[PDB]
Amino acid sequence: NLCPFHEVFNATTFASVYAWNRKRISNCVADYSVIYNFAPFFAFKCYGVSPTKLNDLCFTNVYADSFVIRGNEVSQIAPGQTGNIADYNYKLPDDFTGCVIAWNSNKLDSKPSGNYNYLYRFLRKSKLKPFERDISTEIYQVGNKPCNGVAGPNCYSPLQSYGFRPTYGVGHQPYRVVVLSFELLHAPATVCGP
Amino acid sequence: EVQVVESGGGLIQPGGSLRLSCTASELIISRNYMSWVRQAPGKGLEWLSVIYPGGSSFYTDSLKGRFTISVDNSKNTLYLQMNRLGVEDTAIYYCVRDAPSESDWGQGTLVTVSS
Amino acid sequence: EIVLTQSPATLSLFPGERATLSCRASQNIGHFLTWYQQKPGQAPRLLIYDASNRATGVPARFSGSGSETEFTLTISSLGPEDFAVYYCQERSDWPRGTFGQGTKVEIK
């Protein structure tokens, strides 16, 4: 029973980075060569595992976290990184095992007059713990005077829209990102990679 | 109107160190994007460093090692430790709060490095 | 590194005239650019953010336009108080970014 990797990578819509979508892959036989050999997925980078040995290993589960971010913000998707996305939207641990695949989706995620459907969090009371998700849209009190949860001066909505347009440099163009996180719990290894 | 007040300027010898302080009244510095921007006399502005609401801090390449931004949550103030200052570090240092639609600057404090 | 070249270095106009100021970037920074007003001997003041949006409290005569590599700031009618130094700052890595050299406004 082959895995849905192509169903995750070729999905028509990706989630906002603040609400990054996680899929569990288990009870399957995996094939990472198709992931590795496909041309457009150039931004390939794994930590604690090499792309060459992925077939030999087996894991209890494999998680696929998918989202859309800016091109220059892709560098923040790695162990030990800090920044907007690393702090408030999607944090990976320093001991992260599994890896991140990103590609430019300007052809399909960008829209003339801006794509405001992709949002990210830029204000939070504290950094995210690794693999934490925060979907709260409550108005963030940055000022001293509380504003009772309604937008106003010195209290804003914590989510910012990306506004992707077909133009702009590679840095500001949308990048669809998929993070394959491997897991071992001493349970039966339900995903092998022959 | 939002007011941010800087402090800790003045004279210092070359190669010395200084720590500027910045405080705000109507906002919480701990929960804001607070950046330090200097304006050399008769020269253009230069963004030096920022500290995020979560505590992440970033610096320009030319300043790496010599500057260290920080915050003390209890006092509601922002600090900029400055070390190994040269004659070119003389400038008026602004404590600026950044928001998506607002950018609130303080009046600044002159920092002079001379003998 | 992104370097912004503002032009003209000095813009000499009479009161009531329309002032058009240009900022040009070395790289495609999209719409991420900010315009700052600075009276002499005072801290800068936010005019335009995202290269087109007018900041709260700014009078309607100020407006921004342009994108990618060629940005422009327009004052529809110069009042006496509009005579100042205007800085363009790119915000590709907001709140980080480089500043332009600025453009003073003076006639007499």
Is residue B40 within 8 A of residue B46, CB to CB? The reply is yes
The distance of C106 to chain A (nearest Cα, Å) reads: 35
Of B27, B56, B99, the CB nearest to A82: B56
List the strands of the sheet with C33-38, edge to edge.
C10-11, C103-105, C85-90, C33-38, C45-49, C53-54
Contacts of C81 by beta carbon, 8 Å cutoff, 6+ apart: none
Q: Which of A131, A132, A129, A154 is nearest to A141 (CA)?
A: A154
Taking the domain B4-105, which CATH number applies?
2.60.40.10
**Do the Cβ atoms of A82 and A119 come closer than 8 Å?**
no
Give resolution, Å, one decimal: 3.1
Q: Which residue ranges form the domains of chain C, and what is each CATH number?
A: 4-72+83-105 (2.60.40.10)
Residue C43: which of B100, B102, B108 has the nearest Cβ?
B108
Subunits next to A (3 or more Cβ pairs <8 Å) are: B, C
Chain A partners of C93 at a C-beta cutoff of 8 Å?
72
- Place domain A5-192 in its CATH homologous superfamily: Spike protein, C-terminal core receptor binding subdomain (3.30.70.1840)
CB contact under 8 A, B28 and A143: yes
For chain B, the domains span 4-105
Backbone angles phi and psi of A28, in degrees to 5:
-155, 170
Q: How far apart are the CA of C17 and the nearest CA of chain B, in angstroms? A: 26
Tokens of A160: 């910012």
3-state secondary structure of C10: strand
Cβ atoms A120, A18 nearer than 8 A: yes
Residues with Cβ within 8 Å of residue A140, at least 6 apart in sequence: A123, A124, A125, A155, A156, A157, A158, B31
Q: Is the peptide bond before B14 cis (omega within 30 degrees of 0)?
A: no
Q: Which has the closest alpha carbon to A45: A99, A106, A112, A114? A: A99
Contact B19, B80 (CB under 8 A): yes
Contact B101, C55 (CB under 8 A): yes
Which residues on chain A are in Cβ contact (under 8 Å) with C68? 167-168
Find out whether the peptide bond into C8 is cis, omega within 30 degrees of 0.
yes
